[PDB]
RNA sequence: GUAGAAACUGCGAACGGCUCAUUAAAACAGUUAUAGUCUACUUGACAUUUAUAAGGAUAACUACGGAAAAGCUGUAGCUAAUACUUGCAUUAUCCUUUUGGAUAAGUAUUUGUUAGAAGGAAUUAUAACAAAGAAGUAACACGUAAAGUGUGUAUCAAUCGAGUUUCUGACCUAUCAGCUUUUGAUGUUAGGGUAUUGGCCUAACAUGGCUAUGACGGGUAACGGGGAAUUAGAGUUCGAUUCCGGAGAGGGAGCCUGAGAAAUAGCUACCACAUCUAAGGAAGGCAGCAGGCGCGUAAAUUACCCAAUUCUAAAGAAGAGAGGUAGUGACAAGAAAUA
C-alpha cells in the first residue's frame, strides 16, 4: 500500500500511497528481483518499469528472496542470512517470515525504478544526492581524481576546514617502518651466522 | 595539650614517593588528641613546611585510653598525593570534593539502555 | 560450560605463599608464565605481602605501570606474574636488586643481592632438545629455551645465563661433589653436596644429600638444584646459608637475646 | 592536536555464584600412565615453494516504510578498518686450500623406502630419498636511549588446564543365585570415527566374560572426600552446607560459535507449566542476589558499596547481588552487670 519508490542513480525516493487493488494488480504474483511495467498506479508513472526488491506483510513480518511461497513459514537464521541479526556469535533463531510471492497480503511494497519513462516526477528524478561522504582510501581518491602517482591527494580531499583523514599512505613513517623490518632481518641474520660459527669453533 | 609521637616500622617508598609509618600518640590521663595536632607534630619532626601532604588512616585510641596506634603516610608533594592516592582518601582529607553519588543507579540505568534501543 | 577455572580461593592458594585467612576471599591467581603456580609466587605478594611497599592490589598496579620494576633486566608490567624460584627482580626507583631464593622454612624470600650478582642467574636445565639441522636446544626450569649449548651439558646439569646476552657461561655438572639446594621437598630450601644417588629404573630417581654438619637428607631427583661444585655455591644464599636446624635447637638459639 | 555518542572490529561472557535431584566400583580419595591426546591468554626460543604499499563491501548514518507488541526489521546511497581478500630478495653446501669458482633450496601434517643425543623400553629426536602439503614469514597502529612498544602470525618448548587411564579403597539386603551374550556380551582381524587409545562404532570370526572372596538385582529419608560429634583404648554415628572433585539448571534430546560448552541470565524441538495479544502472532525458565506463593516443626533485607579480596576488558580510571558492609538473627561460641 506504501510503496516505496526508490531511484538509486539520483539516490532518491518517493512514497506513493495507494488503495485501488486494480492498480497494483500487475504486480501480483511477481517474486522478488521482477521488473514490472509500473503503468497501472497513475498517468504519471506511465513509462516506468520498477523492479521489485521488497516488502512487508500485513503483519510487519517482512520478506526475503528465497522462500517462493505466498504466505508465512518460519526457518533457521544463520549469522549471514540478510533478515536477522544475530544477538550472539554463532547465534540462530528461528523466526516467522512472509514469501518473496506478492499478493494482497502486503501491508507494504519496496521498489526501485529501472527505466526512464515520458514524465517527470517532483523530487524523484528532478534534484539528486551524491555519495554524501567522500571516499577515505588514497586509491579511491587516486581513481576518482585520476591523479595517479604525481603528487599528495591529501590536498585534493573534499571538504566537510575538516578533511577525514585518508589511510593507505605512503608515510615516511610507513617507509621507516619498512625499512627498520628490513634491518632487523639483517641484524638477525647477522646474529645466526655469528653464533653458528661460535657453536662450531666450540664443537671442538 | 601535652602528647607524644612515637614512630614504627618507618621505611621509604620511593615507588609511590612515600614514606610508611605507624604512629602511636601516647596521651595519658588526656582524651585522643584529633589528626590536625599531630599533623603539625610529625610536620616539624620530619621539617616539612606544608601539612596537606600527610594522609592518616587506622585510628584506635585502644582500651582504657592514654593511648591510639595508627598509620600515616607522608607525600613528596599534592602532586604525588593525587596521583598515588584514593579519591575516597582524598575527599576525608578534604583536598578534593566528592563525585556524583548516583551509585547503582547507574547499572540500573545502564541495564536500562539497550544497545539500538536509544538512537542517542 | 568446562573451561579453565580463573579464580583462587584464598585458603586454597599455596602455602607458601603465607596468607591470611581472613583477608578476604581470594588469592590473586598467577597468570600463565614461566614458572609453575605452586612453584613460584606472583609479584603482587612478592611486593604487597614481602617487601611492604604496596598495602593494596591498586597500589601494586600503580607502581607496576611506571616501568620500575625489572624481572630478569627486562620491564614487566602484568600484576599476577610468576617470578619463579630463582632470579634477578630490579627495582629501578631505589636501585635494589634481590634474587628470589627458598628459606629453610620452605618459603620464598628475596635475597638483596650487589650489581654484579644481579646480572648472572641460574637456570636448571630440565629437557635436551634438537630440532631442525641437528641442533641442540635446552629447557631450564626457568620455562627458558637455549639454543646452541655446549655437548657436555647434560639433562640435570645448571647453566649460568647472562640476563643481558641471554648466554650460557658456563656449566655445572651432578656429581656426588656438587652442592645442591631442595626446591620441593621436605627439605626444600636445605643445602647440601649431594652424598649419593641412585638409578631407579622406571622410578624415581633418590639422591641423598650431606649437609654442612654432616646431616644427610634424602630426596626425590626431580626438586633438586646444583647451585656450585664442591668448592663453594655460585650465588649467595640467605642468611640460614640453607641450613635446616632442628627443633630444638632452633628454639634454643631463639630464647638467647 | 585533544577528546568523542553510535557503530564495525577485538577480548570476555565456558570464570564466578547456587543446589545436591541423579549417582553403589559409578563419582570420589590416595597412587600411576598419557611411549594414546587437546590446550586460548601469558612466557622463551624463532620462519619455508603497484611495493614511495593492492581490491570490493558493510555497519553506524541519510531518507521512504511495515507491525498492537518484541534485543523485529524491509528497500535505495555512500564510506572505513588489526573486519574480508590478494600480493615484492636470500640462504646453505663442495674444490684449489683470508679468497675465487661450482652445487642445492615447503613449517606443521600424510604416505612409501632407509639411517638412527635421550629414555626403562622407540616405529624417539634427528637425518637421507620419492610423493603430496595446510597455514604463515607484518600492504597494521603508538613512540624509548641525554634503537622501543602494541597488535597479529608458522613451529617447538614452558605455563594455566583438560580428556582418558593403572592399582587399591564404600552402607543395608540372598524372602536377589546365577548373570551377560539376536539388540556388543568377552576377545581377534580389518576398517570407520575421535584430539588421542578403546566394541566407541561397523564387517567377518571365535565363545567367551563376571560370580557365595556375593556376580546380577533390590533399598538408601546416599553426591564423594578434606572433615564433625562422642571418644581411656577400641569403636559408633554424622558429613546438603567455607575447600577440592562430580553433577544439574522445570524434564529429555539436539546444535552453533568458540582454544575451551553438548553452555542454558546461547539457540532448536517435544512434554509439563506459564506471560502479552488488536486473536494475526510474540515472548519464558530465581537449584544467582533480594523478594513472593506453596510446603511445612523448620530458616533473614525486594538495604548500601565496589573501599578491601579478586576476576574480565581495548587492563590505574569501567564493571562485578562475585565479594565486602550494615539490617533481621537467644543457630552455635567467648568475656561479663544485677554491687
Redesign the pocket.
Known amino acids: 500500500?506504501?510503496?516505496?519508490?526508490?531511484?538509486?542513480?539520483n539516490?532518491?525516493?518517493?512514497?506513493?500511497?495507494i488503495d485501488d487493488e486494480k492498480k497494483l494488480l500487475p504486480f501480483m504474483e511477481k517474486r522478488?528481483g521482477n521488473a514490472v511495467p509500473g503503468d497501472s498506479i497513475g498517468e504519471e508513472f506511465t513509462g516506468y518499469v520498477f523492479?521489485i526488491?521488497?516488502?512487508?506483510?500485513?503483519?510487519?513480518?517482512?520478506?526475503?528472496?528465497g522462500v517462493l511461497t505466498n504466505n508465512?513459514v518460519?526457518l533457521?537464521?544463520?549469522?549471514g542470512m540478510?533478515?536477522?541479526?544475530?544477538?550472539?556469535?554463532?547465534?540462530?533463531?528461528?523466526?516467522?517470515v512472509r514469501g518473496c510471492i506478492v499478493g494482497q497480503d502486503?501491508?507494504?511494497l519496496?521498489?526501485?525504478l529501472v527505466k526512464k519513462g515520458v514524465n517527470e516526477i517532483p523530487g524523484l528524478t528532478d534534484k539528486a544526492?551524491?555519495?554524501?561522504?567522500?571516499?577515505?582510501?588514497?586509491?579511491?581518491?587516486?581513481?576518482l581524481f585520476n591523479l595517479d602517482?604525481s603528487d599528495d591527494v591529501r590536498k585534493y580531499v573534499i571538504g566537510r576546514f575538516?578533511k577525514?583523514k585518508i589511510?593507505?599512505?605512503?608515510?615516511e613513517?610507513?617507509?621507516?617502518?619498512?625499512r627498520?623490518?628490513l634491518?632487523?632481518?639483517?641484524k638477525?641474520?647477522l646474529?645466526?651466522?655469528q653464533?653458528?660459527k661460535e657453536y662450531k669453533q666450540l664443537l671442538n | 595539650d601535652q602528647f607524644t609521637i612515637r614512630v614504627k616500622k618507618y621505611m621509604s617508598n620511593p615507588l609511590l614517593r612515600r614514606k610508611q609509618f605507624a604512629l602511636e600518640i601516647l596521651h595519658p590521663n588526656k582524651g585522643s588528641v584529633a589528626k590536625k595536632e599531630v599533623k603539625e607534630r610529625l610536620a616539624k619532626m620530619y621539617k616539612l613546611n606544608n601539612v596537606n601532604t600527610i594522609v592518616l588512616f587506622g585510628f584506635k585510641t585502644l582500651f582504657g585510653g592514654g593511648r591510639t596506634k595508627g598509620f600515616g603516610l607522608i607525600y613528596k608533594n599534592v602532586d604525588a598525593v593525587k596521583?598515588?592516592e584514593?579519591?575516597?582518601r582524598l575527599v576525608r582529607e578534604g583536598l578534593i570534593d566528592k563525585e556524583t553519588?548516583?551509585?547503582?543507579?547507574?547499572?540500573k540505568e545502564?541495564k536500562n539502555?539497550?544497545?539500538?534501543?536509544?538512537?542517542? | 560450560?568446562?573451561?579453565?577455572?580463573?579464580?583462587?580461593?584464598?585458603?586454597?592458594a599455596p602455602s607458601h605463599w603465607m596468607?591470611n585467612k581472613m583477608?578476604?576471599?581470594?588469592?590473586?591467581?598467577?597468570?600463565?608464565?614461566?614458572?609453575?603456580?605452586?612453584?613460584?609466587i606472583?609479584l603482587?605478594?612478592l611486593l604487597?605481602n614481602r617487601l611492604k611497599y604496596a598495602?593494596?592490589?591498586?597500589?601494586?598496579?600503580?607502581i607496576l605501570?611506571?616501568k620500575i620494576v625489572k624481572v630478569?633486566n627486562?620491564?614487566?608490567?602484568?600484576?599476577?606474574?610468576?617470578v619463579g624460584l630463582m632470579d634477578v627482580i630490579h627495582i629501578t626507583k631505589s636501585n635494589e636488586y634481590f634474587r628470589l631464593l627458598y628459606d629453610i622454612k620452605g618459603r620464598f624470600v628475596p635475597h638483596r643481592i650487589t650489581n654484579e650478582e644481579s646480572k648472572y642467574k641460574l637456570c636448571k636445565v630440565?629437557?635436551?632438545?634438537?630440532?631442525?639441522?641437528?641442533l641442540?636446544?635446552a629447557?631450564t626450569h626457568?620455562?627458558?629455551?637455549?639454543?646452541?649449548i655446549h655437548?657436555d651439558v647434560?639433562?640435570?646439569d645448571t647453566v649460568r645465563l647472562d640476563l643481558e646476552t641471554?648466554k650460557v657461561l658456563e656449566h655445572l655438572k651432578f656429581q656426588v661433589g656438587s652442592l645442591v639446594m631442595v626446591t620441593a621437598g621436605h627439605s626444600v630450601g636445605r643445602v647440601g653436596v649431594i652424598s649419593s644417588i641412585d638409578?631407579?629404573?622406571?622410578?624415581?630417581?633418590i639422591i641423598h644429600v650431606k649437609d654442612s654438619r654432616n646431616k644427610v637428607f634424602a630426596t626425590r631427583l626431580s626438586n633438586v638444584f646444583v647451585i656450585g661444585d664442591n668448592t663453594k655455591p655460585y650465588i649467595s644464599l640467605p642468611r640460614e646459608k640453607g641450613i635446616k636446624l632442628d627443633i630444638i635447637e632452633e628454639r634454643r638459639n631463639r630464647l638467647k637475646a
Do not use: W
Open positions: 500500500m506504501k510503496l516505496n519508490i526508490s531511484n538509486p542513480l539516490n532518491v525516493q518517493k512514497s506513493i500511497e522478488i523492479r526488491t521488497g516488502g512487508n506483510d500485513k503483519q510487519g513480518f517482512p520478506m526475503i528472496q508465512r518460519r533457521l537464521f544463520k549469522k540478510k533478515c536477522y541479526r544475530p544477538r550472539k556469535k554463532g547465534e540462530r533463531k528461528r523466526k516467522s502486503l501491508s507494504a519496496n521498489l526501485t544526492v551524491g555519495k554524501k561522504l567522500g571516499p577515505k582510501r588514497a586509491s579511491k581518491i587516486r581513481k602517482k575538516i577525514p589511510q593507505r599512505l605512503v608515510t613513517k610507513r617507509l621507516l617502518r619498512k627498520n623490518l634491518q632487523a632481518k639483517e638477525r641474520r646474529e645466526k651466522k653464533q653458528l | 596521583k598515588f584514593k579519591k575516597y553519588k548516583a551509585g547503582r543507579r547507574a547499572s545502564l539502555r539497550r544497545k539500538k534501543v536509544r538512537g542517542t | 560450560g568446562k573451561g579453565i577455572k580463573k579464580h583462587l580461593k584464598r585458603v586454597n596468607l583477608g578476604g576471599q581470594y588469592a590473586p591467581k598467577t597468570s600463565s608464565g614461566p614458572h609453575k603456580l605452586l612453584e613460584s606472583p603482587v605478594i604487597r598495602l593494596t592490589f591498586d597500589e601494586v598496579k600503580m605501570i611506571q630478569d627486562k620491564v614487566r608490567t602484568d600484576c599476577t606474574f610468576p630440565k629437557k635436551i632438545l634438537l630440532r631442525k639441522g641437528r641442540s636446544i629447557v626457568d620455562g627458558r629455551s637455549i639454543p646452541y655437548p647434560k639433562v640435570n641471554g638409578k631407579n629404573m622406571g622410578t624415581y630417581d
